[PDB]
């Protein structure tokens with residue numbers, strides 16, 4: 114029973130604007146009072162809007178992983194809300210931009226590794242995400258990030274060529290996106306292909322061009338990104354190998 118009684122929720126501060134409405138921080142008093150994120154939905158009086166909004170809760174219900182945000186519950190009477198576990202430090206991109214000169218390279222590699230464990234878990238369940246990007250990752254603590262959006266908010270600059278050309282989204286296309294996400298992390302939250310028009314990305318990729326090696330990115334990590342960006346989907350690694358390779362890279366950086 115994921116249905117939460119509204120009297121147990123104490124709506125707090127607005128922390129952002131989601132695709133469906135404002136997102137707030139709050140308190141859920143079950144177990145002692147716990148920190149929660151509350152997604153709201155401006156137009157959920159409409160059944161069509163409500164179904165799309167609440168699909169993220171139906172999807173998240175299925176998962177249990179240390180690096181995937183937990184669904185606490187839903188309130189399906191107007192105003193409709195989705196209650197999730199709060200990642201108190203917020204969005205990964207802003208976190209990386211603000212903490213750029215204080216975070217060590219070991220921390221950036223650790224974030225890529227933790228995301229790879231969540232994605233290996235989703236791969237083990239045959240779940241295809243379709244929207245892997247640093248904008249969908251949240252920060253729980255200085256040493257913990259979580260995949261935090263399954264709403265499906267066109268992200269051309271992150272998409273695998275087969276996704277752009279044929280609308281095909283598979284486990285291999287998620288690996289291409291994860292490569293872009295790793296580039297974003299190592300770039301301290303800079304977006305891929307800044308200044309380039311969406312319809313021109315396609316052409317550069319076809320021409321064999323890829324995102325350049327971020328400054329101070331270990332060459333082993335960049336080589337791993339280039340493997341995620343094989344044009345042929347069948348040539349991209351799976352998450353079991355990405356996770357193992359990232360663990361080695363992380364330990365090599367920790368040793369210095």
Ligand SMILES: CN(c1ncccc1CNc1ccnc(Nc2ccc3c(c2)CC(=O)N3)n1)S(C)(=O)=O
Nearest residue numbers: 128129130131136150198199200203204248261262
């Ligand atoms: C930012 N938003 C998001 N972006 C990406 C993914 C998910 C969310 C909102 N959902 C969740 C779920 C769990 N924890 C948090 N934590 C949090 C998110 C912002 C912030 C603080 C915590 C503290 C703060 O200042 N900002 N948010 S958004 C654009 O509004 O949908």
